[PDB]
Design a protein around this ligand. Structure first.
Ligand SMILES: COCCOc1ccc2c(c1)ncn2-c1ccc2cccc(N3CCC(N)CC3)c2n1
Length: 265
């Protein structure tokens, strides 16, 4: 352990896109928090993107998004600390797994994910790393979205993006072109939500390959296939298929997802 003002840092509870997350005991109020720890020296090798993330996080207040509580940043020290609310049960699942969620459990969590993403997009944030391991289950059984390390703020109705970040298996095909292109940010989050929902019920990603180039090729050019087990409802298959439409112009949007019959039953 190690003391940091009123906090006692304990075991590591996650990695993430940048830095690590540690359990932290707060002596003043007698409870635990989650603390993201960053090295400025390590960031400088791999400043203002961190303060961009902090400005994003300070804007967000929703029950399905993890709350930033405070930031501890001494210009003397190499480490920067971001204190978040702790969400007890941690990630909803690891992928791959042989114990996927039931349809009913998946629907419950997906409903939380819709509300969270809808909120983020309203606040003009693209998350860019939606996946099961970034969705934390609270004491009340609801999910909270975490890890804004590669998230983008935009102006107007959508982000116009040209860079590829996040977790390879969750990247939309339009973001994997060989030549520089521009693509819509909201549709990227929808694609990642579709990969996430597939993972919820099958316990594995729809496109997988150990070789990065082949994974990209599959995401771009392999038709979606459902595994043999478990069997799932027709309406869930339809929803997943529409979220993993390779054409971002025809891909289902969040207002349409909210009205899908799998979501509303
Ligand atoms: C069995 O799990 C025990 C609890 O685990 C966690 C793990 C992370 C937690 C958390 C609880 N309560 C809040 N967070 C936060 C709070 C802020 C974060 C900022 C950036 C990245 C995070 N994660 C999310 C989980 C992922 N698997 C690793 C990186 C963050 N996670």
């Amino acid at each position: 352990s190690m003391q940091l003002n009123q906090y006692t840092l304990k075991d590591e509870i996650g990695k993430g896109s940048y830095g690590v997350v540690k359990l932290a005991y707060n002596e003043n109020d007698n409870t635990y928090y989650a603390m993201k720890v960053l090295s400025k020296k390590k960031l400088i090798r791999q400043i203002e993107q961190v303060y961009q993330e902090i400005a994003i996080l300070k804007k967000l207040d929703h029950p399905n998004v993890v709350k930033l509580v405070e930031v501890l940043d001494d210009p003397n020290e190499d480490h920067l600390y971001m204190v978040f609310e702790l969400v007890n049960q941690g990630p909803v699942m690891e992928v791959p797994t042989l114990k996927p969620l039931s349809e009913d459990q998946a629907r419950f969590y997906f409903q939380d994910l819709i509300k969270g993403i809808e909120y983020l997009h309203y606040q003009k944030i693209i998350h860019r790393d939606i996946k099961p391991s970034n969705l934390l289950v609270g004491e009340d059984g609801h999910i909270k979205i975490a890890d804004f390390g590669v998230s983008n703020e935009f102006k107007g109705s959508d982000a116009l993006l040209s860079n590829t970040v996040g977790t390879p298996a969750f990247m939309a095909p339009e973001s994997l072109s060989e030549t520089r292109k521009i693509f819509s940010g909201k549709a990227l989050d929808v694609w990642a939500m579709g990969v996430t929902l597939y993972c919820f019920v099958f316990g594995q990603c729809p496109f997988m390959d150990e070789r990065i180039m082949c994974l990209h090729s599959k995401i771009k050019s392999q038709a979606l296939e459902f595994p043999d087990q478990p069997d799932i409802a027709e309406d869930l298959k339809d929803l997943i298929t529409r979220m993993l439409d390779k054409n971002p112009e025809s891909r289902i949007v969040v207002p349409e997802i909210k009205l899908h019959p799998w979501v509303t039953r």
